[PDB]
A paper describes a structure:
Myosins have a highly conserved ATP- and myosin-binding motor domain, a force transducing lever arm containing one to several Ile/Gln (IQ) motifs, and a variable cargo interacting tail domain. Phenamacril (experimental code JS399-19) is an effective and highly species-specific fungicide, even though it targets the conserved motor domain of myosins, which are found in all eukaryotes. To identify the phenamacril binding site and to elucidate the structural basis of its mechanism of action, we have determined the crystal structure of phenamacril bound to the ATPγS-complex of the motor domain and IQ1 [FgMyoI(1–736)] of the F. graminearum myosin I encoded by the myo5 gene.
The converter adopts the pre-powerstroke conformation that is characteristic for myosins with open actin binding cleft prior to the release of Pi and ADP. The pocket is lined by 17 phenamacril-interacting myosin residues: R189, L213, L214, E215, K216, S217, M375, Y409, F419, E420, C423, I424, D536, K537, N538, D540 and A577. The ethyl ester tail of phenamacril is deeply inserted into the pocket bottom while its phenyl group is oriented at the opening of the pocket. The amino group at one side of phenamacril, which is protonated at a neutral or weakly alkaline pH (crystals formed at pH 9), forms charge interaction with the side chain of D540, while the cyanide group at the other side of phenamacril forms a hydrogen bond with the side chain of FgMyoI S217. While phenamacril could affect more than one step in the myosin/actin cycle, its binding therefore likely arrests myosin in the “open”, pre-powerstroke state, similar to the proposed mechanism of myosin II inhibition by blebbistatin.
Residue numbers in the entry:
A (entry chain B): 9 to 19, 23 to 40, 45 to 76, 81 to 114, 117 to 146
B (entry chain A): 37 to 728
Write the structure that this text describes.
Amino acid sequence: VSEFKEAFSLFGDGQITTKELGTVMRSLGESELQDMINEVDADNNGTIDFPEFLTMMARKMSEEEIREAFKVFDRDNNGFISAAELRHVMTSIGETDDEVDEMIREADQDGDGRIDYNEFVQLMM
Amino acid sequence: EIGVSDLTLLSKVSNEAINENLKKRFEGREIYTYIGHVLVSVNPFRDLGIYTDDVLQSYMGKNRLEMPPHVFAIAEASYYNMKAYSDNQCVIISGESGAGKTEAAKRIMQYIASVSGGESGDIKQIKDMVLATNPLLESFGNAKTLRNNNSSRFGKYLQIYFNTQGEPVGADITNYLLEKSRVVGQITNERNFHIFYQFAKGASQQYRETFGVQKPETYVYTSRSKCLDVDGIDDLAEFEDTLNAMKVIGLSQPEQDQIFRMLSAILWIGNIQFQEDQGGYAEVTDRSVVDFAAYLMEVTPDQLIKGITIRILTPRNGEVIESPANPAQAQATRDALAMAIYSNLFDWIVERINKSLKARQPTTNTIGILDIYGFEIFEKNSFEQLCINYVNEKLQQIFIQLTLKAEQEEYAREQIQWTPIKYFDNKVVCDLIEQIRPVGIFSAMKDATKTAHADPAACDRTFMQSINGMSHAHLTPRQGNFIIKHYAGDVTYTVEGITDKNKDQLLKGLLALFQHSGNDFVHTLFPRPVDTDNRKQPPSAGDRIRASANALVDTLMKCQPSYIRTIKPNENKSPTEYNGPNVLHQIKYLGLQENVRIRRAGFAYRQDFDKFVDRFFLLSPATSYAGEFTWEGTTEAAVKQILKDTSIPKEEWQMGVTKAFIKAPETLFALEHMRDRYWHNMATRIQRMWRA
Ligand SMILES: Nc1ncnc2c1ncn2[C@@H]1O[C@H](COP(=O)(O)OP(=O)(O)OP(O)(O)=S)[C@@H](O)[C@H]1O
Ligand SMILES: CCOC(=O)/C(C#N)=C(\N)c1ccccc1
Ligand SMILES: [Mg+2]
């Protein structure tokens, strides 16, 4: 709740426009965004509000957390994932084949087609 | 954009406001409207082009709120909930005859087949055979009535069985009592079942030569009603659809030949006419007709004539009398044979479909679609209409139970603040029909025929007495007729011939006839071993429909319901005529205002603590570590933790004694989507590749 209001203040009425929202989204890290924007028009045609912002963000929606995610993916449950099963999940959520080949190249020095993600987490930081 | 797409958003709530909304929308070709999760569908009687694969894909993966109201959204929601909570689903569809129950059922199947995917060959087999069932069953069980040109004359409950991948592995069709009487006669301007006109008009040369199949105008069963052609129905095209579908389902060319032999036998039996002999007995008029009918039945003409014209009477235990029938009695037995053939044929077709569609893999979940025959009223109403309207009354009762009663009772048990909304509970009407110990309509009919006297007239009189003796708010005895105050209105049932219709029992000599047959399919449709005990008084049609209906109720209460209320805007099948008063009557007796009021004041979503944790534990960092459940406390406190951690406002949710309630649909769709994007958000959490 705080995080939304502080990143809503940064980018001073409290009624904000769609372009400013696009900038907020970019700041965090396209068509779907405007789809989220377009589900309240009674209040104002080109602007929205902070309760509406909570609404549309939930309707969309540190070190340890990034650590966790690797354990989430690991079906073996042993610290080691298939590198091509990592490729696939970098493809599907999509967030460049060359970037995935470079990032898998860093971790591909293991050599067995598998990845120890604890070491690679520490490397990544 | 026309009026209000979800009646809970009406500015003023009344039946008249609802009627106005549906009428503006219908005039703007928006036949679909919501009451919360419930779908109302007004029959456009015109092809609007809203069931294209383009539209269909436009509904994939959406929730009720991201798209305009559509039957596809109800089906999407059913399939989503199936794979989400791993829960069986049932779709309930109400409507008067001609309101569009059957078309909505088919659009739901269409959506499920398209969305459910599956690339395996067996899977595509299932999907195509399921779809092929539609033309086959419609051709054998639908016919033109005054109220609807493609009128379901049988009830249906289709279950689709899915594997863990959410793919169609198998199907199962449960059929309710068919209107067999149609086979032998119709109201003027009504037709027989579609199949007879398809086959009479378009029979192959082979069939036309072996089986004698002439054009429908030559048969009494297909021409006496003075209707051979139907608006918007091409019989020869549809005959070809029938044949292809039979092939898809796996009928060999012999099986098909047997079926069409029986249909041709029926038509020929229908042309047998009688005159009165020197003793007043029945005598066949044209020997050639009976001869051909016997050929088709694979019996001798003497055997067919005897079976049609001689009644086996057992007055004492050890005495049997052969009593020759008079011409009227012989016509009665003729039609009894025709009806028995067609009914047993239909039952065989349904069993064979069930065999072809049986699960080839292990099955995980089911989706059921109910398509019953709708409430209907004619100038004359007999047992047929009583059975159909009884089923509609039971379905109304299910709707009331789920949509209005059960929810409010749950509010009261869960100490949620609630002022109960009043509604008319029609269980008394169901009681009036389906009651045994306090004799009801069906039971009274059975008791009248319990004596098993040769004469139906006396049984009808005994029944009329029983009816007079009953005192019940929804029953009104009259001179040889009785009115039932059904949920949907007054229906006047004619008492004449009603108890014989209820006592749906084949005569002894007619049953003796099938034994002599040379045809294997005839022996398939009429096994000899069930004729062992003549003395017994066998089950009645009302017994069978009572059993079917209460089976159905148990089934439906074992699955997660989705609701479709179809509305018939006019009795002329006009795309532009909107009969305000008729829609208003419908709105009223369906309790659409009550649904509106509950849905506005009600909570949108209710879930048990167990299943809620099981489904939404991933949302909380407390309750979830690395996609694995881990909670040290109670389930209730886990629910409270998950809700706090999602940071939805406290006003959007409420904690009961055993269950957890979420008020607004938007909140629920948000939680569901947050749940769906969990793996997406962990993968999103590994995306800090650009260091600076
Ligand atoms: N969604 C629809 N779009 C276009 N036409 C429709 C639609 N629904 C129904 N119709 C038309 O109305 C006719 C009746 O539709 P049905 O689905 O057969 O009604 P029904 O409720 O199943 O009737 P009963 O109760 O079985 S006699 C159809 O043949 C169509 O011509
Ligand atoms: C949809 C309800 O169909 C029926 O129940 C039905 C028919 N037709 C009969 N019980 C019946 C039996 C024998 C003779 C005439 C009628
Ligand atoms: Mg129908």
